[PDB]
């Protein structure tokens, strides 16, 4: 969980996290509060998963587009600044961080892609996309390339798509229409087709990512690149004399870059909400603090008017703002994440030749407008399949509760719980969604495949492997008091007396234990033997209230023999046999193994508990889950 008295921050690695750490050091010098600054990979995906359970950071930094999804899930706490403080920042930045009338994060600064070019290779850089191909032929002859930039994230490739009319969500009459998506209209098709034509003309490489392009440009091996303010510092250090200029225009229209607002939200499970208020308002959002972060890796056009007016004189900031005005500001709705995913796959597949432009955008079109609840159920059941291998242990209520958490809506009313069930059933009916190929569980020597976990479904007969591993779990839950003989013990002892099991207990002195559990597998029926070592009693459990008279006699002969061969003759005598009364009793012929495992569990744990034949569907699911966890359910 989250520690109290310490502030812990997440911010992406391409920002000035060291510069922010200097701000935290001052906070610690003036208040005694340690401030930790971490930059985990994939932190935007992580923050939901951990903030749901109370863990995670005190403060979360990301472009505003993600925060809708967080506020939808109750993960962000409401920002409460003075009107005095709110006047200090440009109003349209507070717009980026307002979700359904509430403020959910502090704006920090404004980001937009621009065209960064090598002044010495290319004193006059192209104004249009269309003239770049010939330029690249002219430079490749000189030994170097025209352009390189990140082709693995769609934020970089989007402006070309949106130039001739690509868009994400129609913004009409104040609201975003999430059913009207512009990722396969002919303008977006036009943009991406021009791009993939560059890949097929060997003017750019389809595998280029952020690191490759940055190295190319800063080493002077390529004359142009596309990036944000954060890149500039690493070029100040390089060989290159660079400028920041307007992006080229595709089909006479400006490239529309999506504009992000770096925003610091607050975890709703944070015990340090006041501390984060103080840090963000009075240390970070000052001229001094933004200066620190800006010097490590630039922020761009900061929200704090006072410092922005001092930075605005920079030609690079001016260029970034020009590109911003020609673009469109990112939405902050929860569907934005689903939009970005859809486009990332479409670009990568189109440039890799695995899909056409028209088909990749056909796919992205449907996914970006997909019903949010449906895709959530898809993800939940896919994760469940990866964890437990099948949907055998799945409870419908389980899915219902997860959805209630995510969307902060009710789902248990009949009309809604029924929709959840229908979605689950459609998921199950698709191919490959039944079980995981090669799914495995490994606990010490034991191994279970889906052929073993399958015996827990419905009214199937549990097999030897399931029973033996679950017994080892019961024993290892209280191992100084319990020892568990596997199912093969009894058949040997019955046939060949003590000599067939005389080497069974390797180094185990069963007579220092309190309880020994011995399953009894005959044909298809499972029974159980329970030895109370302290009281020297042998006791036979049958879920059908039928005693096997010879079984406890075999057990008794074995126990005396073991007392002889282990020099434990103080345990040689006093044994009495019992047929157990007042326990659960099956009505069918097929739940016997489960009855026995439950008997064992509640003999070992000695907690108040009862169950019945009618509890068996629940308990079967529970046993499955305990096995996969390699832990019993306390």
């Amino acid at each position: 969980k989250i520690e109290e008295g310490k502030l812990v921050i997440w911010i992406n690695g391409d920002k000035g996290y060291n510069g922010l750490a200097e701000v935290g050091k001052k906070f610690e010098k003036d208040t005694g509060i340690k401030v930790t600054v971490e930059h985990p990979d994939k932190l935007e995906e992580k923050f939901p998963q951990v903030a749901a359970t109370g863990d995670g950071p005190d403060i979360i930094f990301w472009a505003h587009d993600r925060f809708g999804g967080y506020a939808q899930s109750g993960l962000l706490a409401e920002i409460t600044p003075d009107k005095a403080f709110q006047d200090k920042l440009y109003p349209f930045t507070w717009d980026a961080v307002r979700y359904n009338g509430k403020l959910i994060a502090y704006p920090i600064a404004v980001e937009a892609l621009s065209l960064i070019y090598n002044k010495d290779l290319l004193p006059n850089p192209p104004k249009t996309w269309e003239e770049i191909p010939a330029l690249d032929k002219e430079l490749k002859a000189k030994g170097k390339s025209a352009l390189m930039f990140n082709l693995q994230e769609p934020y970089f490739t989007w402006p070309l798509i949106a130039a001739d009319g690509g868009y994400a969500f129609k913004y009409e009459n104040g609201k975003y229409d999430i059913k009207d998506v512009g990722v396969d209209n002919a303008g977006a098709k036009a943009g991406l087709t021009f791009l993939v034509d560059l890949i097929k003309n060997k003017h750019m490489n389809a595998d280029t990512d952020y690191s490759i392009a940055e190295a190319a440009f800063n080493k002077g091996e390529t004359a142009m690149t596309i990036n944000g303010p954060w890149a500039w510092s690493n070029i100040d250090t390089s060989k290159v004399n660079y400028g920041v200029t307007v992006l080229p225009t595709f089909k006479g229209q400006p490239s529309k870059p999506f504009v992000g607002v770096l925003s610091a939200g607050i975890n709703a499970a944070s015990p340090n909400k006041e501390l984060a208020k103080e840090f963000l308002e009075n240390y970070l959002l000052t001229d001094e603090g933004l200066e620190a972060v800006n010097k490590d890796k630039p922020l761009g056009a900061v929200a704090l008017k006072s410092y922005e007016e001092e930075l605005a004189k920079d030609p690079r900031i001016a260029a970034t703002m020009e590109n911003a005005q020609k673009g469109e500001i990112m939405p902050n709705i929860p569907q934005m994440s689903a939009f970005w995913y859809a486009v990332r796959t479409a670009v990568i597949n189109a440039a890799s030749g695995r899909q056409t432009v028209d088909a990749a955008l056909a796919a992205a079109q449907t996914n970006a407008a997909a019903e949010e609840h449906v895709t959530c159920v898809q993800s939940i059941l896919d994760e469940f399949l990866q964890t437990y291998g099948s949907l055998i242990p799945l409870s419908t209520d389980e899915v219902v509760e997860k959805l209630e958490d995510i969307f902060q809506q009710e789902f248990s009313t009949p009309s809604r719980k029924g929709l959840v069930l229908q979605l689950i059933q459609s998921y199950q009916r698709m191919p490959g969604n039944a079980m995981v190929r090669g799914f495995r569980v490994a606990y010490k020597r034991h191994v279970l495949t889906m052929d073993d976990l399958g015996t827990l479904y419905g009214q199937n007969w549990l097999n030897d492997q399931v029973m033996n591993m679950y017994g080892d779990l019961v024993m290892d839950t209280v191992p100084e008091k319990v020892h568990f003989f596997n199912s093969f013990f009894y058949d040997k002892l019955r046939t060949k007396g003590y000599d067939g099991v005389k080497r069974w207990t390797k180094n185990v002195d069963i007579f220092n234990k309190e309880l020994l559990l011995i399953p009894i597998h005959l044909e298809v029926h499972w029974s159980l033997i329970s030895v109370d070592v302290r009281r020297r009693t042998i006791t036979y459990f049958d879920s059908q209230r039928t005693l096997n008279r010879r079984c406890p006699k075999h057990i008794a002969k074995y126990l005396q023999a073991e007392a002889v061969k282990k020099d434990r003759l103080d345990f040689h005598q006093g044994w009495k046999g019992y047929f157990k009364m007042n326990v659960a009793r099956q009505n069918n012929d097929s739940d016997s193994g489960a009855f026995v495992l439950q008997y064992c569990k509640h003999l070992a744990l000695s907690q108040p508990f009862s169950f019945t034949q009618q509890d068996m569907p629940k308990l079967r699911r529970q046993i499955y889950k305990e096995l996969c966890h390699c832990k019993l359910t306390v």
């Binding site: 042998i538 006791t539 036979y540 059908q544 209230r545 039928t546 005693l547 096997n548 008279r549 010879r550 406890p552 006699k553 008794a556 044994w575 009495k576 046999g577 019992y578 047929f579 157990k580 009364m581 007042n582």
Partner: peptide
Amino acid sequence: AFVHYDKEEASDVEISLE
């Protein structure tokens, strides 16, 4: 050698080990 018990006796039933 098996024995079925019709009802549920009050306490557990002591049985022979020899």
